[PDB]
From a paper:
As the virus buds from the cell, the viral protease cleaves [name] into several fragments, including the capsid protein (CA) that then assembles into the mature capsid shell (core), rendering the virus particle infectious. The CA portion of all retroviral [name] proteins folds into two separate domains, the N-terminal domain (CANTD) and C-terminal domain (CACTD).
Hence, in order to appropriately address the plasticity of the polyhedron CASPNC lattice and any potential conformational flexibility within individual CA hexamers, which could be associated with their different local environments (such as a varying curvature), we devised a subtomogram averaging approach that uses classification and alignment guided by local geometry and contextual information (and see also the “Methods” section). For further analysis, we rigid-body fitted individual CA domains into the EM density maps of hexamer/pentamer unit pairs. Pentamers, on the other hand, organize rigid vertices, where the lattice is curved in different directions. The hexamers that are adjacent to pentamers are deformed to allow bridging of the tube-like areas and the pentamer vertices. Specifically, the two CA monomers facing a pentamer adopt an arrangement similar to those two CA monomers in the pentamer, causing an increased spatial separation between the CANTD’s of the hexamer. State A was found in all dimer interfaces involving pentamers (with higher curvature) and low curvature hexamer–hexamer interfaces, whereas state B was found only in hexamer–hexamer interfaces with high curvature.
Numbering used by the authors:
A (entry chain H), D (entry chain C), I (entry chain J), J (entry chain F): 10 to 148
B (entry chain G), E (entry chain A), F (entry chain D), H (entry chain I): 152 to 229
C (entry chain B), G (entry chain E): 10 to 148, 152 to 229
């Protein structure tokens, strides 16, 4: 069952990003805090939509896609990925990682249903690395 | 008005990009026409130093995020 | 039977030579067009009398004579010329080529009667080469600068024209055009070419790059 | 048997390009008109030599070469090209497309002899696309 | 009138030759007297730079076309 | 002092590079810290024309010699 | 046995490079002189460390590495390199060329022991070519005009210098020098060259003609 | 004295040649040294207009008579 | 037997050439008068030495040689020259025309002995034409 | 075996030419000194490249070529040239004199191998005469 993040925590994090900036160690610590439980693509996408401005959000979408593509290359380079399965029918496509696959587009409940925990942690680590890249790039 | 937005002589590029994306997304354009307009406004606004920086891009930039990343990488630190 | 060329085509060709000049590729194409069927000496002579001015016509008469003399030297160097015959009685004299022989002076009908098709095609090729020589002679790359108000495509057109229509070898035109793009073409475009992250090794590539990144104004 | 294009039509087209420019819809319509019958490499080459200036002609040679190379890549990607044949002995090299092959250099009659109709239409479409590219690039 | 034709201080040589040949051939002279007159008018008209250029001709020029070719070759580019 | 070296408005780039490399190598830095410092001083000193010239480098320059070669190639002749 | 180069010769060469520069023909001749016997990587490295400044030395290290890499590519493209051997165990790695291999780092005696004469001559030629590249890089013909008061031999010297010390191919220098003599070289000499009864087809012939018939003033 | 003979600014060339040949043949030179001396005096005397006229001779003149004929042909009528 | 021309007539002709010039019709008439009887090479040579200055004399020697060479070409082109004979042993060399042959150098008596009347008239006409050329050239 | 000239002597000679000029008797004496041993085309070419400026060097190349051509004309006029041999296979071409022949272009060692001593002394005398001509011409 999907539970959304508190809008109070999200508002506090957005104001933190607004006053301290993207690169302060306190901001990265707060992001790591709100990045503790494995989030669904819907959660991370809406979170970055709210806390980041338009241009940093575009940059972050780009960087997240690139990092997810590196993850999928490593996944096709190793059939023992915690997102993959043993047979070929469990291979994870980027539509399933970005939340674009069938039964997931716009629906967080179905998303949480079909996604694997390894998928969730890989998406989360990818999003964190992308946030770091964009923060280092913006300023 | 989005079509009247220029990057000031002293303004940074992230502020200009924020202002432009805000004015373009909060306007009367269809949703499928915002990205091309944002790109073509990055190319024609954004005073001629960044204009030439985007023009001489060995890669083809097909997204506002990619253009922003490229410009932030290769911008003239000043 | 001799049929004259249309005065309408001749008038259009004369106006083409008058506006475009003698050396433009469109003018040479038009001349090649009106030089399609083998012409009698009368036809080519009157054609050059009409389309060319007096001084270019004198130059062209000279050049045509020289080229016909080279042809007659090659003809006496080979008895199998399409203008010649097998016996010595068919050897072709310059009076027969220039239309000065007996039964031909001023009469195009008799001309067409006695002349050979090989004679006609040799005369025609000679006249074409003479026209090319005179055109190259009648009308400096290192003095070409891009004006303060001139666009870049006009400057490139002028420079490539003057470099290709000059005395340089064919293998020295591209490097000269490149190095003239780099040193002429006023300092804004000079710096635009200098700061090229890629290496431009062809005039076309330089033109494309400059047209992409030029300062719209 | 090869028949040349009328120098009257070519002169009119050259003056059209001179007054209206390269990109006007009337100019493109006129080019499409003079691009109706499949032309031999000699014809298109001389046509572009006459109607285009020196620098646009260089650009057009470049673009025509690139488009012909794309065509030859598609041809080696499909043995059923109307320019190709069934056996390997009919594979079409760029020397045959640009008119540089043996028995074709400078001779339009031999050109028309050895060339295929599929070869002619491919060359013609390539030249038209190259003209469009150069026209979009010049202004 | 052919005998009144001079090469102007700023006029090129091909224009002067065209004008002179026109006026000489469209005149009352016999046909066998046009070439010598054209030559001797090239030599005495055609302001003293070209006069000296024709005078110091190592070869003997015996035709208006040859004189025109020689002068066009060795003329002072300006 | 290496951290006080600036490229003068009229100074050429090879003189500035000579002075900077001299002051950096004849200082108290460890040997393994001279190249990164020389690079980052080329990037932040070396007045904004050369700063932007180094910034917009399509290739990544990872050595003082490579930076010097690139700048000498693409420098504004004046 | 390794013998070092004289510090007196090295000091004289360093002062030559300091006063004349890197590109003067006397400097290149002196470098060729001190590049006569095949040098060990230690010798050439210390020589360039002493005679070149810091930034030219960095550039020279880069260029030397690139040229040595081209040499090693040619060596793997031909097993008959005078640095290589017949078997695969004599293949020469860049650590052995740059003096970085085992038993060579910092020791010139061991260097001279293990190195081949072909290795030495290849290293030496590579270093010479790298020096030439850096000299051409460390320090415009189409902008050269003959000043109103300048003599013609000075203008010819300046023009030939700038044309031969440029990026043109070797087969394009003479035509460019001629056509620059004709279009530059203020209109008195322009007309003097134009009205040449003979055809001048060489810069030396043009210079001789102009020096003969020039207006003494 | 032959070595002091110059062509005056207003003197014609045949008078100068007469005077020079007279003074050279009526002097103390050997008979086999008169022609080369007369030629080399035509070339170095005979004020610079005729000097340049003789210098730019497409043919090689190897006799005083040939030089005189050439100069009389191509001289500047004045 | 050789008889020299009167030095009185030669002095009068020299003064005529001195006052009237080389090209006046009276001077040419006087030269034609003193060119009435066929002269030996010695006579014409001394006459031109006396009446002409040094430079016109050099020019006249050149022109006389050229005209005599044309005469000898016409003579080898026709064996019926009044200077020639029927057999090959009477062919006239330029040494015999210019007075340089054996038995003639410096001796006018021997000259008059060996020379033919056709030789004399040819030499005389050649000298007259050469005088005309030099007179037209000098002024 | 080829030995190069000392760059010290060449530097001193270059400075002599720079201060005294090309025509001073001391400069010609110094050139005669450095022209004592028979030099290979490489040596003389590099020497004139170093001591002479660009325009005098062009003039000197011209004059050297002309003098070498006169030498080769005299050589074809006499089969007993110290550069020639007795048979026709030893005839010396200008490519061998200017150092342009096969096995000589750019290589002084091979040059010294194939060249004759008569060839060397002829090249040297030709270069000296050319230097004299250019020195008399420059000033």
């Amino acid at each position: 069952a999907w539970t959304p993040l508190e809008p109070k925590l999200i508002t506090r994090l957005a104001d933190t990003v607004r006053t301290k900036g993207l690169r302060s160690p306190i901001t990265m610590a707060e992001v790591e805090a709100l990045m503790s439980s494995p989030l669904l693509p819907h959660d991370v996408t809406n979170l970055m939509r709210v806390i980041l401005g338009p241009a940093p959000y575009a940059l972050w979408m780009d960087a997240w896609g690139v990092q997810l593509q590196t993850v999928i290359a490593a996944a096709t380079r190793d059939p023992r990925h915690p997102a993959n399965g043993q047979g070929r029918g469990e291979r994870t496509n980027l539509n399933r990682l970005k939340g674009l696959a069938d039964g997931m587009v716009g629906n967080p409940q179905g998303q949480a249903a079909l996604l694997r925990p390894g998928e969730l942690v890989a998406i989360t680590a990818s999003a964190l690395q992308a946030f770091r890249e964009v923060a280092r790039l913006a300023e």
